[PDB]
Amino acid sequence: VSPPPPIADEPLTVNTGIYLIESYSLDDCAETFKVNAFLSLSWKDRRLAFDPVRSGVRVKTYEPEAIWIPEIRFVNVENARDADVVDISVSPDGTVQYLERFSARVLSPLDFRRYPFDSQTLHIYLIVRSVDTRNIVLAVDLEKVGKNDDVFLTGWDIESFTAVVKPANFALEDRLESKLDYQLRISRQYFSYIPNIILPMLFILFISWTAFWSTSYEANVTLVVSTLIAHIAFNILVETCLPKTPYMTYTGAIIFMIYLFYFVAVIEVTVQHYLKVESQPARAASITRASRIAFPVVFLLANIILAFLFF
Amino acid sequence: VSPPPPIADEPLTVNTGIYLIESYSLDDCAETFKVNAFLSLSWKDRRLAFDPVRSGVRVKTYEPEAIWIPEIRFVNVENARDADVVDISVSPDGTVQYLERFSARVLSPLDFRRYPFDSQTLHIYLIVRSVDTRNIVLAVDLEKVGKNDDVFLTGWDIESFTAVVKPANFALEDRLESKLDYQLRISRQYFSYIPNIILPMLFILFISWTAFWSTSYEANVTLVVSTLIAHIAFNILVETCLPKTPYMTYTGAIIFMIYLFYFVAVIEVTVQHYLKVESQPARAASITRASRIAFPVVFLLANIILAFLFF
Amino acid sequence: VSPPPPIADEPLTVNTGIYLIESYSLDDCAETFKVNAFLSLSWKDRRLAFDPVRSGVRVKTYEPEAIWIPEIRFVNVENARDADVVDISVSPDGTVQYLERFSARVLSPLDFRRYPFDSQTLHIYLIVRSVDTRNIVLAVDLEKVGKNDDVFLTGWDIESFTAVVKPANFALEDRLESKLDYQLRISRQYFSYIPNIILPMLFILFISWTAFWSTSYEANVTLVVSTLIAHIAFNILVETCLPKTPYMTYTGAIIFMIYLFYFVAVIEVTVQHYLKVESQPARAASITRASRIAFPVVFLLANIILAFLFF
Amino acid sequence: VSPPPPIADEPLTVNTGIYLIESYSLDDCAETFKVNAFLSLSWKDRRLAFDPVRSGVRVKTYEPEAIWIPEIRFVNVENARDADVVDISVSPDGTVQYLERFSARVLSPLDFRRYPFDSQTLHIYLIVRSVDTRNIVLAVDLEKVGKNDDVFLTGWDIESFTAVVKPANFALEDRLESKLDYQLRISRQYFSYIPNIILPMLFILFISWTAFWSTSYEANVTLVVSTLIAHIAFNILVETCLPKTPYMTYTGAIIFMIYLFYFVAVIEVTVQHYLKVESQPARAASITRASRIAFPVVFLLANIILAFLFF
Amino acid sequence: VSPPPPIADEPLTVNTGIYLIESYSLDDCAETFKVNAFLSLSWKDRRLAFDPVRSGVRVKTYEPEAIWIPEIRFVNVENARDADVVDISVSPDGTVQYLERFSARVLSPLDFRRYPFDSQTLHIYLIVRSVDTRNIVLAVDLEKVGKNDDVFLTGWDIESFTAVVKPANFALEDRLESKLDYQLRISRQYFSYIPNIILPMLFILFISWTAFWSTSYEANVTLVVSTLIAHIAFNILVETCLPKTPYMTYTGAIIFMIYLFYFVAVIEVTVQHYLKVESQPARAASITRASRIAFPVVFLLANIILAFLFF
C-alpha cells in the first residue's frame, strides 16, 4: 500500500489522542518515567469509502496489514514502544479510527533547582515524517486526550495531562516532520523529606551548638566532629537520589551552607580552648556568649535569603 | 474473523477466571508484584455449534487464529502479559472454553500507614472493550478462580484470592469497557522486624539513658551522640525498604519521635553540666533524678498514644 | 493435529528426562536459581509408525510443526522457559524421541533456619494437562536424568540431581494434571562466613570485654559503644544477604543474643562508675571481677544451648 | 536477491548518515552510553532504474524484503540494535534512499585521567563487509550527519557530533571490510563535584589541622582520627562512580595524597604528646608552631605540582 | 531438512572459528563475561553442488531456512545466544561458508586465590550433537580464530584468544557430542587496589601503632578502636567485589590477619593500663617498648610467609 491521495492539493491531517492508563517509575537520576496508554489515530482515506446499503453494515473493520497506516513515532522514548493494535474502524466516507495500546519509557529532563519542592512538566512527543507523495500533519482531538482517575505516580501529585494543539512543523533530512507535545504536569510530594532528611539534619546541627554552653574542649570536639559526620551521611544519602546538576539545588544549598556552620563552630571551639589555655577565659567567654546568639541568628537569616533566592 | 452475532439484542458475556500458580517479587518501593497464572475465558459462539451423535466427537479443538477470541487485556500490568495458549475447546451448543498461561508484573498501590504491621489488597484488573457489532461484558466463573496450595509470597501471609463478581461497566472514548477486580489479600510477616530493627533501636536508646546515672559530661556526650548516630543508621536503613509516602508510617513515627528523645537528652546532659560548672550540683542532681523516671515514662506513654492513633 | 488415540482405555505416558548443563545465580533473597538443561520427552504415537524395509530408513526425523507434541510446562518458573528444539526422532513402532534444550529462572523456597550451615532441596516441577480425548501422565526415564560433571553453583556444593519417579496426579479445573518433582540437592559453603562475619564479630565482642579490666568510665563507654556500632554494621550487612523470614535463623539468633551482651555490659560499666562515684569501689571491684568470668562463661553456655536448639 | 552488479569494475559506495534524536545513560563504570538516532543509507542499484515520463511517478517506494539492502552493522554495540525502517525511496536512475530509526547501547572507552575535569570522544563505528560478487565501501554524506538541538546527556556538555569522512578499509577473514568513525565529543559538568566532594573533603582536612592549636592529646586524636574516617567515606564514595583504572585519576591522586597528610598529622600529634610527657614542651611547641605553616604550605605546593602534572 | 549423506563412512566435519569484536562486563561475583563476536562455520554438503555455467554465478547465496545448517550451540552461555546471520556462501563443490555474528553472556569459573594479582582462563565451549543419519565432529580453522586489536576488558589485560584444536568427543544420552574449547587468557590490573585499598588499609593500621608511644589509655582506646572500625569498612567493601569462596584469597588472608593485630593491640593497651593503675609502670613500659618493635616485625614476617604460601 501507499498514502491516501489528495482530493485537492492538501496535506494529510492525522488526528491524535493519548489516554493514560498507568504511569510509574519516575526515576530522578535517569530523568525518565514509564507510561502505559491508549494511542488513537484518525485520518481520511477516500479509497476506503463505501455504500452502507450494498454491504448492509454501518462500519468496516480491518487488520493493520490490509490498509495504509501513518507511521507515528515517539521522539523521546528510550527503546521504541511495545505496541498492540486494539481496533481499526472505517466509516462510510473513509474516515479511519485507529486505536492501539502501548507502553514506553519516556526520557524527559527535570529541573532540580527547587528539590524537593519542585514541580515538573513531563513531555511525550508524537511525530510523523512526510512522504514523497504527500505531506503529513498532526492534530489533537481533545475528546481523546485524558487519563483514568486511578492514575498515580508514587511520590508525586498528578496535576494535569494536556496537549499543545499546534504542531511544530519543521524540516529534517530534507523532509517535513510534524511534532506534537503532550504534557504531564506533576509536583513532588515533599512531605517525607521533612521527618526523614530536613528535621534529622537540623537536630544534629542544633546538638553541635550545645558546644557553646561548654568549656570542655574534649567534649566540644566530640560534639562538633560527631554531628559533622552525621551531616556527611545525610549529604551522601541525598546525592544518591539525585543526578549531578550543573546548578545548585535548594536542598543542596542548605546542605552545603551547613558545612560552613560546622567549620566556623570548630574554629570557635578551637579559639575558646586556645584562650582558656593562655589564661584568658574572659575573652573566650565573650566569643562563646556571642556564638550562642550569632549562630542561630546568622543561620535563620541565611535560610531566609536562600528561600528568597530559590522561591 | 468477526464477533458472534446476537440472537436477540443481548451483550456478549465473557466468563473469566484467574488461577494463581506462582506469586513472587512483592516490591514495596515499586508497589508491584509478579504473578504466574491461568486465565480462562468462556463465551457462546453459535457459528461454531455442531452435532455430537454424528460428528464422531463430543468436543472440537481449534487453534487461536481459526476462531474469534475476545481481546481481554489487563489494566494494571507494567508490560503486557507473556501469554501461552494451553487449550481451546468447543462444545456442541457452541460454548468455547479458552485457557492460557500467563505471567505479569502488576502495579498495585500499597498502604504503608501501619508498616510493618500492614495488610494489603492487591488488585488484578481484567478488561474488555466493546466492538461495533456487539457489546462485550465480563463475568466471573467462581469455579475457575483460585490458587494452588503452594502459592507463597516471601515475607507475606496469603489470606485469599477472590473476584468481585459485579463488573464495572463504563464508557471510555465513546465505547463500552467492562472491568473486573480480582483481589489478592495479603498481610506482612512483621516477625523479623522485631530482632532486626525494633529491638536493636530500643537497646541503643536505653543505652543513651544510662547518661542519667552519670555526672561525666565527656562520657554522657559520647553515650548520647554515639547512640544518636546508630539511630540515624537504622532510620536510613528503614527508608531504603520503603517508597516516600505523603503520610507518616507507624515505624516512621516511632523513628521520628525517638529523635526528639535524643535531642532532649542532649539538652539534659548540657543543662546538668552547666549547673555542675556553675557550682550548683544540687539543681543538676534534681533534673537528672527526674530524667531517670520522666524519660522511660514519657516514652512508654507516647508509644501508647501512637499505637492508639495508628491501630 | 490432535493427540494419539488409545489402544484400550489407557492414559498416554510421556517419559521425561532433565539433564543439567549449567547451574547459576542462586539468589537467596529472591529464592530463585537459574538452570540451563536438556529436556527429553518420549511417547508412543501409532499414526507415525512405518515399515523399515519399504521406507529405506530405520528412523524418521520431523520438524515440531509436522507432528503432535505434548504440552509439557514447568510449574515454578518465573517466566515461561526459553526453548530450542534440538531433535525429533521417530522409530518404526511409532515411538517419538523429543529433545530440547532450555534455560529457566526457577522459584524454589529455601529454609534459612541453619544459615549459613544450611542445605537445600531445590525443585523443578514438570507438568502436563490432560486433553478431552485422552489423559496424559508423566514418567521418569532414569537413563535420561543427570548433570554434566562440570556443573557448579557458586557458593554451594552440588550433592545430587534426582527425580521422584511417581508423578503427583491431581485434578485442576476439572481436568487431570500430572506433576513431576526433579530435585537438586545442595549444601552451602559456609567457609567464607568464618573469616568474614563470625570471627570479626567475635573479636569486636571480646574487645568490649576489656572494659572489665578498666576503671575508666570514659574509656569503657568508648569501648562498649564503639564495638556495639561495629556489631550493628555486621547485623545490617547480614540482613542484606537474606530475605525476611517469619522464623529466627541460626546466625540471626547469635547476632540478636549478642545485643543483650552489649546491653548488660553497658549496665555493668554504668554500675561500676556509679559505685566508684558513691565512694564504694570495693562493691564495684567485686561486680567487675565477677563480670570477667560471668560474661565469657554465660556466652559460651548460651552458644551451646543455641547450637543444640538449631542442630 | 544479490548485490547490484558493477558497470565498470567499481566497488559499491554506500553513503551513510547518523542523526542523533536522543542520547542518554552515560555509564562511567560500564564505559557505555545509549543513543537513539536515524541511520540513513544511499547507494546506486541500476536494476531498480525506471523511465520518469513512462512511469508518471517521480519516485518509487519499496518494502525492505523487496530489494537488496547492504548489511550495515555497528562494531561497538552491546546487543544488536533495535531497528525500525521508516522509508525506502528509489529515484529514476536507481539511487535508493534508505532511512531507519535505531537505538543502541554503545561501548566506548573513557579516559578518566582528568576526572572530574575530563572530556571524552565517544565513537560509533559503522561497518560493512564485502560480498563475493562485489566490494562494498562506506562514505559519509555530511548533509545527513547531525543531532537535534534538544540532545542532552545528563551530567555532560555535548560539544559536537561529526564523522571522519574517510573510511578505514581493511581485510578481515579474507573479505574486505569498510569501517566509519562517527564521533560524539562531550565534556563533563564538574560543577556538582565542588559542593559535593571537593569542598566537604577540604573542610574535614582543615578541621584536622586545628590539632596544631591544641595541646590536648585525647582531643587531637579524636580530631585527626575522626576526620580520617570521613576521608575514607569520601574515597569509598568516589571509587563507586568510577571503574578501576591502571592509572591514577586527578581526584584519585588528590584523595591518595590527603592520606599522607593525615598520617603525618598523626605522627606530629604523637611526637607533640611524647615530648609533653618527657617534660619538654618547648621542643613540642616548635614542631607544632612549624606544623601550623608547613601543613597548609606543603599542601598548597603539592596541589600546584599535581594540577601541573595532570593539566 | 536432514544432514548431507556420507561418501564413505566418515563423520561430518564442521570447521569453526570465533573472532572477538568486543568483550565487556567481567562480573567477578556472577563469574561471567560478555562477548560480541563472529562465529564462522564451514562444511560441505554435496547436495548443494552446482555447475557455474548452467547457474550463471561462481558462488551461491542462501537464507538459513533454505539449506541444512548444523545445530552448533554454546555450552556455558547464560542466555542462549542472540544471533544474526551475515552471510551463507556455497561454492560449486557444495562447500558451505557460514558467518554469523553473535553476543553472549558466558559463565566461566574464576580462581580468586591470588586476588587482586590473579590471572584467569575464560572458556567459550562450542558443541554439536550427532544425528541418526551421521556423526558430526567439530574442528578449528586457525585462520578464522582471533580478536580485533581494539578488544579491551575494563580492569583487565587481554593476553590471548586461542582454541584447543582437538575436540572433546564423548557420548551423552546415547548420542555423540563434539565439544570445542576457545580460551581467552586475561590478567587483572591490580594497580588501583594499591592507592584504593592496600595503602589506606596499611595507614590506618600504622596509626593504631602510635598507641605504643602513648601512656594515655583513653587516647589509645580511641586510636585502636577507631582504626579497627575503618578496617571493618575496607573488609566489607572488599567482600562486595567478590563471591564467597570455599578458600582464602590473598587479600582476604591479609585482611583477616590484620584483625589479629588489632585484637592483640587492644590486649597490649589493656595490659599497659592495668599495670599503670596497679602502680607498676616499669613492667608496662617494657611491654610497650617491646611492642614498638614486635608489632612491625611480626607484621612484616607474617606478610612474607603469606606472600610465599600464595605466590
Ligand SMILES: [Cl-]
Ligand atoms: Cl516510538
Ligand SMILES: [Cl-]
Ligand atoms: Cl495486558
Ligand SMILES: [Cl-]
Ligand atoms: Cl513453562
Ligand SMILES: [Cl-]
Ligand atoms: Cl548493529
Ligand SMILES: [Cl-]
Ligand atoms: Cl547457544
Ligand code: NA
Ligand atoms: Na571519645
